[PDB]
DNA sequence: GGGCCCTCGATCCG
DNA sequence: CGGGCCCTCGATCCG
DNA sequence: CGGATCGAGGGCCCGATATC
DNA sequence: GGGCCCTCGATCCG
DNA sequence: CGGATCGAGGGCCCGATAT
């Protein structure tokens, strides 16, 4: 009787996330702030939804796929389950930045394995993965075709969160920076050719999954904090009820109305 | 030419120690004796087969990557007198007591992790493995029926093993109400790629277990490959 | 002396 | 077992 | 200086509901 | 609650 | 010594039903 959904937050904790740009909170602290915001809403509203947490670029390896020397810097901190206060306390202070770097696509595969195995039976209505990275780490394009195929077959939606915001398609996208502020919320020159290459791959993947408008699902940590886009994919239909628009006599259009705006 | 690798996987759950109200040895006792018989036969025959004995569902865990509840009693190595003597400590009703004392039983396991350790055991062999085979001795027809995650992960790792070249053969033991392949073991076990599916029945006697084990024991070894010439032009090849 | 039998050694294939 | 509705109190200011 | 008003409580109908 | 259907058990004759 | 019969089992629809 309620909209359930399996959400897995895939956070980059690599050393480079600890690398901080003057004035701006380090992408690690920025992603942490966004994750805490998400979990906080899911916890205090007591919504029935299970949340898993995967961290990539950690010093150690605790992952089911670690067999084979593969994914040795990806740790599944939280398995798919209803979020609790212990999880919020761990995100707030227990989870510390790591010294290694991982392949963000490899981490995405770990998250996918979590969804594929812990979602058995129509227990969950929606499947969603949220990647939090800076793209500064090198990566391999080997299974990208398979990643996209497995995402479609499993019906899992994606959402990317970077320290920088999408520059305007043509022209435009540097003084003071304020997290959550409108406008100057990311260094225009801070992008690295490595970040640019990762971004092009991110763009292609989002377009391959949700078409041309998939690119709108790539946010910056700052703007993500001043929007409800983090819940977009797990957002519940407004409660609707049926009636009849009665014009006169004999004309009666069968309708169904819902509350568009409600405080 | 090459040395064959064979790993004996034995279930150590609460159900395995029950003699199903009969004169027959408990499925665990049946397994231990069957394994011992294979070891002796391998010593008698002149075959370079490397054997291993791995237990799962035990409280005490001893393995390469320290996975909980997995005890690798014997690594992949040639059969020896000392190895058979070690298995003899578990043979019988008195041996069951010796097993429960040395290591625990009926502990929560994870079949996914069990196959990971086993595959990692073949990884550590240097001589060319002609055949990789795992023989699962268990009486639980639907393990992890309650845990959905452990069951799907086990199905996935079984697929990964079949894609590697490892053979998975089931040695289902007496279960109250019969043993069902459809619940579990139907897809995990490796079936012949040219169909030949639903081929063996549940084992009740040691003689039956030994006959199924020894049938898939060694891969068919052709003495010679000759040409069967029906006519100057019609020639088929036979082994 | 003749049949018997077993154990190695030398000959080739998988 | 929920959803919308509506009223009754309680706390804040203006006349 | 009491009213007027608005957040945030409380109480009755009505489609899904395990129930005979 | 009402109709349905099947499977035994108890009742008598060949 | 089988039929016919009659309880008392089993499984799907439907007005009151706490939800």
């Amino acid at each position: 009787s309620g909209n359930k959904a399996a959400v897995v937050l895939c956070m980059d904790v690599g050393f480079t996330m600890s690398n901080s740009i003057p004035g701006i909170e380090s992408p690690f602290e920025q992603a942490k702030k966004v994750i805490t915001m998400f979990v906080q809403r899911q916890v205090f509203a007591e919504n029935k939804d299970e949340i898993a947490l995967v961290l990539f670029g950690t010093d150690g390896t605790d992952n089911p796929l670690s067999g084979g020397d593969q994914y040795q810097n990806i740790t599944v901190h939280r398995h798919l389950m209803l979020p609790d206060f212990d999880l919020l306390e761990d995100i707030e202070s227990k989870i510390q930045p790591g010294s290694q770097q991982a392949d963000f696509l490899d981490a995405l595969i770990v998250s996918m394995d979590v969804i594929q195995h812990e979602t058995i039976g129509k227990k969950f209505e929606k499947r969603h993965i949220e990647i939090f990275t800076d793209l500064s780490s090198r990566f391999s394009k080997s299974q990208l075709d398979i990643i996209i195929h497995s995402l479609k077959k499993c019906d899992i939606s994606l959402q990317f969160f970077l320290p920088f915001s999408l520059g305007k398609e043509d022209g435009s996208g540097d003084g003071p920076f304020r997290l959550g502020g409108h406008g100057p919320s990311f260094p225009l020159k801070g992008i690295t050719e490595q970040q640019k290459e990762g971004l092009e791959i991110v763009k292609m993947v989002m377009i391959s999954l949700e078409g041309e408008d998939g690119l709108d699902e790539i946010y910056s940590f700052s703007e993500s904090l001043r929007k409800l886009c983090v819940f977009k994919k797990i957002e519940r239909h407004s409660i609707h009820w049926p009636c009849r628009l009665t014009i006169g006599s004999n004309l009666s259009i069968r309708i169904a109305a819902y509350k568009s705006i409600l405080q | 030419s090459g040395r064959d690798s064979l790993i004996f996987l034995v279930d150590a759950s609460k159900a395995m120690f029950e003699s199903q109200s009969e004169d027959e040895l408990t499925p665990f006792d049946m397994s231990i004796q069957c394994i011992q018989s294979v070891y002796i036969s391998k010593i008698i025959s002149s075959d370079r087969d490397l054997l291993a004995v791995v237990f799962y569902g035990t409280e005490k865990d001893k393995n390469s990557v320290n996975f909980k509840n997995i005890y690798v009693l014997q690594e992949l190595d040639n059969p020896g007198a000392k190895r058979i003597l070690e298995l003899d400590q578990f043979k019988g009703q008195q041996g069951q007591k010796r097993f429960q004392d040395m290591m625990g039983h009926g502990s929560d396991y994870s079949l996914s992790e069990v196959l990971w350790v086993c595959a990692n055991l073949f990884s550590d062999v240097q001589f060319k493995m002609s055949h990789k085979r795992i023989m699962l001795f268990t009486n639980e027809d639907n393990p992890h029926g309650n845990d959905s995650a452990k069951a799907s992960r086990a199905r996935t790792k079984a697929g990964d093993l079949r894609d590697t070249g490892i053979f998975l053969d089931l040695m289902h033991l007496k279960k109250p109400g019969g043993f069902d392949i459809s619940l579990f073991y139907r897809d995990i076990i490796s079936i012949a790629e040219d169909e030949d599916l639903r081929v063996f029945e549940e084992s009740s006697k040691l003689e039956d277990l030994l006959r199924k084990v020894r049938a898939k024991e060694t891969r068919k070894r052709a003495l010679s490959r000759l040409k069967l010439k029906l006519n100057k032009d019609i020639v088929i090849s036979v082994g």
Side-chain angles (χ1 to χ4, degrees):
Chain A
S1 183
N3 282 248
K4 301 183 64 166
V7 196
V8 63
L9 304 166
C10 205
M11 188 197 187
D12 190 18
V13 195
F15 188 62
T16 49
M17 291 287 284
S18 199
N19 294 354
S20 178
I21 310 312
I24 303 197
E25 290 204 48
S26 71
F28 174 85
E29 285 299 326
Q30 283 193 48
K32 218 168 91 171
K33 283 318 189 285
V34 183
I35 281 146
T36 314
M37 182 204 53
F38 176 84
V39 188
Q40 269 178 5
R41 166 79 135 174
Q42 301 291 298
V43 166
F44 294 114
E46 291 178 358
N47 296 339
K48 294 183 176 179
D49 257 357
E50 292 198 342
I51 289 125
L53 176 75
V54 170
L55 313 164
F56 62 109
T58 52
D59 282 27
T61 312
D62 185 4
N63 174 43
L65 310 169
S66 166
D69 200 359
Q70 303 283 310
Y71 311 98
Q72 293 297 111
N73 311 290
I74 296 156
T75 311
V76 180
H77 188 84
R78 177 91 161 200
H79 285 88
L80 198 71
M81 61 189 84
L82 266 169
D84 50 40
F85 290 85
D86 297 0
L87 171 67
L88 278 156
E89 191 190 58
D90 288 356
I91 316 178
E92 199 202 301
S93 199
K94 208 214 184 184
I95 297 140
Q96 311 272 57
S99 307
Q100 313 296 301
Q101 302 277 307
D103 193 308
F104 76 96
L105 294 174
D106 259 357
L108 175 63
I109 296 158
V110 169
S111 293
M112 276 190 272
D113 189 276
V114 167
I115 283 157
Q116 289 172 222
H117 290 291
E118 277 144 74
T119 66
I120 289 169
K122 297 192 177 181
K123 287 161 187 194
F124 294 97
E125 284 181 79
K126 294 147 179 76
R127 288 132 177 93
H128 191 58
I129 302 164
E130 282 173 42
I131 299 106
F132 301 85
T133 191
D134 62 357
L135 298 168
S136 58
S137 320
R138 306 189 284 194
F139 68 99
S140 173
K141 295 146 196 67
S142 49
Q143 289 175 345
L144 269 172
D145 297 347
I146 300 108
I147 285 149
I148 302 156
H149 179 60
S150 283
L151 275 158
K152 291 173 176 190
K153 165 207 282 185
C154 283
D155 187 57
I156 315 167
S157 40
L158 288 190
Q159 272 191 298
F160 282 87
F161 303 93
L162 275 63
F164 51 95
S165 199
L166 63 94
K168 291 71 179 174
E169 177 184 359
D170 49 5
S172 180
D174 187 63
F177 296 130
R178 278 189 184 189
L179 189 75
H182 299 274
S185 304
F186 65 104
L188 287 67
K189 295 189 177 291
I191 183 147
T192 72
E193 292 183 327
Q194 178 51 247
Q195 288 174 303
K196 278 170 104 173
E197 191 200 316
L199 183 72
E200 291 315 300
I201 294 294
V202 166
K203 289 201 213 184
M204 273 185 174
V205 157
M206 286 318 291
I207 297 153
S208 285
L209 183 80
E210 284 165 59
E212 191 206 34
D213 306 282
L215 293 166
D216 304 336
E217 292 311 284
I218 309 158
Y219 310 90
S220 70
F221 302 128
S222 84
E223 75 187 22
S224 177
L225 295 151
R226 60 147 156 94
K227 269 152 171 277
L228 291 178
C229 66
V230 277
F231 318 106
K232 183 192 148 73
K233 302 278 177 191
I234 66 181
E235 205 163 357
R236 274 177 179 172
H237 294 274
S238 182
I239 309 293
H240 84 94
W241 53 264
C243 198
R244 200 181 282 118
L245 192 139
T246 300
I247 297 157
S249 176
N250 311 356
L251 186 69
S252 296
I253 305 151
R254 293 176 55 176
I255 54 99
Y258 88 82
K259 295 175 188 307
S260 174
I261 315 296
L262 187 82
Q263 208 195 141
Chain B
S1 190
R3 278 188 177 179
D4 305 336
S5 305
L6 186 81
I7 300 175
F8 301 107
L9 185 57
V10 169
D11 197 319
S13 193
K14 301 169 179 181
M16 284 286 287
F17 305 98
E18 291 325 338
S19 186
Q20 282 306 113
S21 307
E22 284 175 351
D23 295 36
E24 204 65 30
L25 299 149
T26 54
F28 180 82
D29 212 321
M30 264 192 277
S31 310
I32 193 58
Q33 283 199 68
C34 174
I35 297 317
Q36 212 180 300
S37 302
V38 174
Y39 264 94
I40 67 154
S41 298
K42 289 268 164 190
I43 297 169
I44 298 159
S45 60
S46 65
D47 60 343
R48 307 181 79 189
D49 295 19
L50 309 140
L51 311 170
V53 175
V54 283
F55 297 103
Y56 75 96
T58 168
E59 79 164 350
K60 193 183 171 185
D61 55 308
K62 185 184 169 158
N63 65 85
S64 44
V65 289
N66 301 334
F67 267 177
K68 294 305 299 175
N69 312 101
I70 298 141
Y71 202 105
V72 56
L73 194 98
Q74 283 165 32
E75 275 194 358
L76 274 164
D77 210 345
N78 286 99
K82 289 170 192 179
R83 276 155 101 87
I84 293 158
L85 188 76
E86 193 186 48
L87 286 56
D88 211 0
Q89 309 308 289
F90 313 113
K91 186 178 171 180
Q93 185 187 11
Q94 284 91 20
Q96 192 186 301
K97 296 175 179 189
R98 288 183 205 106
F99 186 83
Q100 317 192 117
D101 181 37
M102 189 181 176
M103 309 137 285
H105 73 128
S107 335
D108 219 1
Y109 53 85
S110 43
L111 292 164
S112 51
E113 287 177 41
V114 178
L115 296 55
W116 197 64
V117 54
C118 288
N120 195 249
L121 256 167
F122 295 111
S123 303
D124 313 339
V125 182
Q126 292 184 338
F127 198 91
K128 53 190 169 183
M129 296 99 58
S130 43
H131 284 79
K132 302 178 250 277
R133 193 174 296 118
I134 302 163
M135 286 173 167
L136 177 56
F137 298 88
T138 185
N139 69 340
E140 184 64 69
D141 68 325
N142 187 14
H144 313 151
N146 46 12
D147 203 307
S148 55
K150 273 185 283 287
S152 191
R153 283 151 165 173
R155 285 183 192 97
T156 308
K157 201 54 202 321
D160 289 2
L161 302 196
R162 293 182 298 161
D163 301 320
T164 306
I166 307 143
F167 290 84
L168 287 64
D169 300 310
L170 181 73
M171 302 306 169
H172 48 295
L173 314 150
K174 318 193 294 183
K175 192 48 193 197
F179 198 101
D180 204 347
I181 60 99
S182 172
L183 296 172
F184 199 84
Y185 295 112
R186 180 168 50 176
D187 303 328
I188 74 170
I189 64 145
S190 205
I191 55 97
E193 198 71 43
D194 308 333
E195 260 211 343
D196 306 337
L197 35 85
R198 305 165 292 104
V199 56
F200 50 107
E201 200 69 23
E202 56 165 28
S203 193
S204 54
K205 288 179 212 62
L206 168 69
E207 304 180 53
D208 304 316
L209 272 169
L210 272 166
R211 230 199 298 117
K212 183 59 186 171
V213 162
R214 264 200 251 163
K216 205 48 173 180
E217 188 194 41
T218 296
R219 207 57 199 237
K220 299 188 283 170
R221 296 275 177 184
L223 179 76
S224 57
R225 286 173 281 194
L226 291 156
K227 285 189 190 171
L228 196 146
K229 190 172 186 189
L230 281 90
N231 166 240
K232 304 172 189 176
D233 307 322
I234 308 107
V235 181
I236 69 145
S237 60
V238 287

